[PDB]
C-alpha cells in the first residue's frame, strides 16, 4: 500500500457532502433575451409580409 | 498599558472620558496624561530589557 | 530509470553479495528459476535497478562475481538461488590470492582485470542511465582487498561521475581471521580513501554482538550475518525501487552525509531486531524504532559512538508511518543526545521514507552513521600496522612480488591523516 | 477568460498538485475520467472550471498544470494512479536522475536539459488561454528540483513572460524540524529568485501545519496528506474569486496592489480558518468574528513566528461562504480595537476585503469539517524576519567551516553564490526592519 | 455546428432563471441570520464523525 | 503658502482611534471662539490638523506648543503615590508600591 | 448583554463547577447533552441561559466556563462523567504534573506552560460575549493549582481585561479541620497577591458547611457533593438576578458598590437560608423574617468565625421566591432594633436588598427541600480578623523554623515573598482593626 495511493482514492463529487455550485454569470455579449422577443413577435397576427405586393 | 480591547476601557480611565470632553469643549487643553503614560511605558520597557 | 551495477569480489564478497541478491530476489518476487512470481505491480515497476529482462518474465541480476580462484563462487552456483546469475558474469582465474594484497592487485590480479572491465563495461553500457556501482568485499584478504581496490580505481577512471558504494567488511578489534590483515586493510583503505564515494564499514564482532544480545541466536552462522548486511543494502537502496513519501537515492545520501570528500566511512545499522521471545513484550512504535536505531549496540561497526561525535546520520524508514512522528523522533533524539552531535551542523539527520516495508514486517529502519568514532578503527589498524612494520614481518612477501616500502609508508601516512581529520572535526567548535 | 496556470515542481510540488487537483475536481464536478455529468453552460463566466480546466472534444476537461520532477518516481506514481486519464501525458514531465538536494545540480548541470521542454509545454499551455491571470508555482526550499530547477524556471519566466503574475507557493524549512542537511544551503540559495522573479511568495512551514493539525484537527499522527489537503484548501480559497461570484470579488491584480507597498516586501503569511474537526464543529459557533480572530490567532499562523513581535502591514481577507459585510465590518472593527494586533504607522486603512458566495468544498474522507463560512487571510506582516534569522544563523554556523561546499563547487557553481545570497538575505532582513520601525 | 434559434434562446432563458433560483436559495440562507451566522449542518457533521471513527 | 509635515508621538493602545477636540468644531458659539485663539497667539486656528489623535498617536504638530501642555501639573510626587491613603482607589495598588522603596 | 465567565481552577474548583452546572442545567432545562428541547410557550425566545450557555448550530448549548487543573483524573472524571458531551473539548484544560500542594510550583514552574493556553480560552469565551459582566472564579486556598495558578491567572486577567469584576469564591482553610500542612504558606502567599486582583472575595469554610449539614440538614455522614451543592445554590442565588426578572434586582456591580467600603476590605462571608431538608421543613412556617434571622445566627454561616465578636459593615441580602418586600423591610427593622447584632457607626443604612421572583431549583439527589422563600446574605464584617489571626499564628509558628520552605525555594521562591506576605497580612489586620474602632 502506497501513502498517496491510499490517500487519493476515487472521490465522488456531489451528494450530501456538497453544496450547489454557484456559477458566476453568463456573458452579457452571450445573453440576448430573445425568448421575450419571440413571445412579443407572436402577437399582432394581422401583419402582412414585407414583400413587393404589399 | 491596559486591556487588549479599548472597547473595554471602563469609561473612568479613558482619554475621551466626559470630564476631558468638558475640558476640550474650550480651547487650550492638551493634558499631560497620554504623554505621561508614554514615558511610563517607555521606562518600564527599558527596565524589562535590562 | 536508474541502474546499479553490483560487483562482488573475494570469497566474503561472493557470499555476502549472493545473500544480498537472494534477499532482494525474494523481496521483489523473483523465483529461483528467475521469473516474476509476486503479487503487486510495485515489485515489477522498478525492477531494472538490479535486474535485466532476460526471457519474457525472467529477470537476471546485474551481478559481476570476481575471484582469483573459483572457491565460494562454485558453492554459490550450486546453492539455492544460484542459477539466476548470468553464466558468463563469473570471472575467475586459477591461481590463489593467499590473503596477499599484491597478489590480488599487481601480479595475479593483472590477468583478470581486463576481463572484469570487459564484463562490467558490457553491463554498464546496456543501462540507459547508469547511477553507480556497489562493491562487496573484505579489507582483510587478497581478492577482496587487492582486486577490489584495483577495480574501484579502474571503474573510477572510466566513469568519474557515478556513485561508488563499497561495503568492505573491515578487520575486527578482537580475533584476526587473517594474520596479515593490518597490511591488507592499510593498503586497501589507502585507495578506498581517494576513490570511493562512500563506504559502509562493518565489523564481525559487532555482528556477533548483534546476534548474541539483540537476537539470542545460539547458532548464528554466517548466513544471518550476510542476511543483516543484505538488509542494510536493501534499506539503503529501497528509495530507488519503491515509491515513498520522501525519497532519497545514493547520490542524495552521499550529498547529505559527507561534509568533506575524505570523510565517507559510515556505520550501518538495521532496526527492528528482536530477541526470539520478546515481540509480545515490545510494541511497535516509531519512537522505539528510532531508539533502537540510535542505540549503540545496534550498528554493525564495533567502534562506539559515545567515544566520538556524529557528523551526520541518515535514517531510511520503510513502512506506513507519519512524517510528523518521524521528524519529531529525529528532533527528540538529536535534542536529548546533544553531546553526540557536532555543534557546527544543525540537523545532522537526512530522513527518507519508503512505503514498502520488508515482508513479514510493519516497519523497518536503516541507520547510516558518519561519526568521528571511525578513528578508533583506523587507529587500531594503524597500531597493528606499525607494530609489525618496524620489524618488517610478513613483508618479504610483498617485496617479493614487487612493491616498495614507500607505498606502505604512504598508506600509513594517509591513514594517519584521516585519523587527524576525524579528530579535528570532533573537537572543532563553531565559535 | 480568467485562466491560471499551475506549475508543480519537485516531489513536494507534485504532491501539492495531487491534492490541489483532486480538490479542484471535487469542487467543479469533473470525474477523474475527465467528464462533467451536468454541464449547462454557455461560456464567458459560467464556466467556472475554465480557470483550471480547458476544453477538448466530446466533453473532456484537461487541467492547466505542468508537473516537473527530475526523479521519475512520484510523477510516475501520478501517471499510474487514479488521476491517470485526467492529465495530458506531455504535461507530466520527468527526467532520469534527480538533483539529489543540490542547487548546483538542479541549476547548472542537470537543469539545462529539461527546462527547454518545460518552457515549450508552458508556452503550449498558455497559448490556448483567452487571457491569463497568473502562474501558481508550487515548490520547496528543501533543495534539488524545488530549488535549482525552480530557480531557473522563475528566471526564464520573468525574462520572457514579462507582465504576468507569478504567485509562488513555497514550503519553508522549520526552525527545528528538517529532513536534510544541505537544506540551509539550498534555502539561502533560493532567495534571490523569490526576491527578483516572484511577484508574491507564500512561505509555509511544515512544523506549523503539524501544530495546526495536532491542535485543531485532533490528528495525533499527521502525514503529508493532511498538509497537502489544507494547502489545497488555501489556494482554492485564494482562486475562488476567479471562479464563483461574490459580493466583493478580488482578482490577483487587486490582491497584489493591496498587499505589497514596495516591490521587495512580497512575503505574506497565509492562514485559513476554521481548520477544525467535526466533533469541535459541534461545540463551536463558527461565526465571522470567530473565524477572523482565528486568522489573527498567534498559534494559528503557518510559519513559526508570532506576529506579536511584529507589525501588520496589509491584510487581505478572503471570506468564503454565507458571509455578509454586516458581519465583515463588525469583525474588522473588533480587530482594529484590539491591542495585540499592531498595525504599521503608515497604513491606517490596512484591510482589503473580498467576499465570495460559494462555501468551501469538503473532500470525502479528509479531516476538515464542512463549514459554510471561512476566511483565507493573506497578511503581509513584518514578523517573517524570524525565519530569515533562523536560516541566517544556520547558514552562518554551517558555512563557517565550509562543510558541504565541494559538491556545489564541483557541480559547476562558483563559491560566491553563498556570499551573494547571504548578502541578499541580510538586505531583506534590514529592509523589513526599517519598514517595521 | 448548429443554427442559433429558439432552442438556443430557451437554453439561455433556462440559464437565467437557474441563476435566479440559486440567488433566491442564497437569499433564503442569508436573510435567516440564525442560519447565516450560527449555521453548519448536523447530518454532514455526523457522517464525517462516523468516517473519522471508522478510519 | 507654507509647509506643515505632520508628526506624531509613539504608539500606545489607550488612544481611541480618531478624536478631535470639541472646541475646534464647536459651532454653536464659534464667532468668539476663534478670537480666544487669536489674542493668545500660541494656538493655531487653521482648518488643518484638527485630529489631536489620528490613529493611536498624539499630535505633536501645530496644536499648542509643547510647553503649557506638560505645565498642568497638580504637583504630585513619588512620595504621595508610594504611600496612598486608604479611602481612595489608589490603595488598590499597595502591595506593588510597597516593593518600590522610596528614594526619589 | 449580560454574561459571566466561570473559571473553575483546582480540584476544589472543578467539583464545585460540576455541581454548579448541574444546578444551572436543571434551572434552565438544559439536558446533559446540552439541548433545549422544543416548545411550550417560551420556544426560540428564551434568554435565561444567556449568562451561562452560548448557542451553536448543532443545538449544543456550550458552557461559558473553563475547568482548569494542573493534575489529571478530575478533568478526566468530568470528561467521562454524565456531562461528557455538554462541555466543549478545549474548555477542559489539564496538565501533566501535579502542583504538589506548592504555591511556588503552581505559580512559577509548572503553571507557566498552561497560563497562555487558558488565557487563550478565556479570550475566546470573552469575544463570544458582547455584554460581559464578570469572571466568577472558584478555588480553594489549600494549595497548588487553587493557590499558585489561580493567583497567576487572576494577575494575568487583571492585566488583560482591565479591572472587570473578578468575583472570587475561595474555600478558606478551617481552624481545626485541615487537609494539607503547607496550607498556611499556600494561603498567606495567595492572600498577598490576590488581595488586590479580586474585587470581591467570598470566603467559605468546609468545617462550617460540615456543621451546617450535620445540624440543620440531618446528613450526619456528608461528603464534598453536599458542600458543592450548597455552594452552587449560594452562587446561583447571586447570579439569578441576571437571568430572572422581578422586584428590586442587583447586578454584579451594584452589590459590589454597596458591599465593599474600602478597596482592600473586600473579603465578605456568605450565608444561605433556609438550609433545610424535606421532613424537617414540613413542620415549619418558612417566612421572610425568620429566614433573615436564619441568616443571622452565629451558628449558621459558611465561615467558622463568630460575628458577635465583630461588627457588621455592609450586608447584601438576596431574596428569592414569592417574597413581598414589606416582610423584608420588617425583618430589616427587627434585626436593626435587636441589640445582639452590632453595626459600625459609619454605616446607618447597612443593607442592600435584591428581590427576585424565581424560587430555587432542587436536584434529584440533593438535600435541600423545595421551598417558597430563600435568602442569600453576603456580609462584609470585621469578624474575619479572627480568621486572619489564626492563619497568621500558624504561618508564624511554621515559618519560625523555616519548615517546608526548601520546596518553595526549589520551585522558585525566596524568603522575601514570605516576609512581604506576612507584613501585608499584618497591614490588613491593622486596617481591619482601625476600621472596626
Ligand atoms: N508539506 C509537504 N512537504 C513535502 C511533501 N513532500 C516533500 N516535502 C518537503 O520536501 C522537502 C525535501 O525536499 P524535496 O522537495 O523533496 O526535494 P525535490 O524538490 O524533490 O528535489 P530533490 O532534492 O532533487 O529530490 C522536505 O523538507 C519536505 O518538507 C509533502 O507532501 N507535503
Ligand atoms: N467544599 C469542597 N472543598 C473541596 C472540594 N475538593 C477539595 N476541596 C478543598 O480543597 C482542599 C485540598 O486542596 P485542593 O484544593 O484539592 O488542591 P488542588 O486545587 O487540587 O491543587 P493541588 O493540591 O496542587 O492538586 C481541602 O482542604 C478541601 O477543603 C470539594 O469538592 N468541595
Ligand atoms: N560477514 C561475513 N564475513 C566473512 C564471510 N566470509 C569471510 N568473511 C570475512 O572475510 C575475512 C577474510 O577475507 P577473505 O574474504 O577470505 O579475503 P579473500 O581470500 O581475498 O577472498 C575474514 O576476516 C572474515 O571475517 C561471510 O560469509 N560473512
Ligand atoms: Mg525528489
Ligand atoms: Mg489536585
Coordinates of C-alpha atoms and ligand atoms in Angstrom, one line a residue, chain G residues 10-12 69 71 74 98 143 145, ligand 5:
Chain G
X10 CA -8.2 23.4 41.2
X11 CA -9.8 20.1 42.1
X12 CA -12.0 22.1 44.5
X69 CA -6.4 21.9 36.8
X71 CA -3.4 17.5 37.7
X74 CA -10.5 15.1 37.7
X98 CA 0.6 18.0 39.7
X143 CA -2.6 24.9 47.8
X145 CA -3.5 24.7 41.4
Ligands
LIG5 MG1 -5.5 18.3 43.0

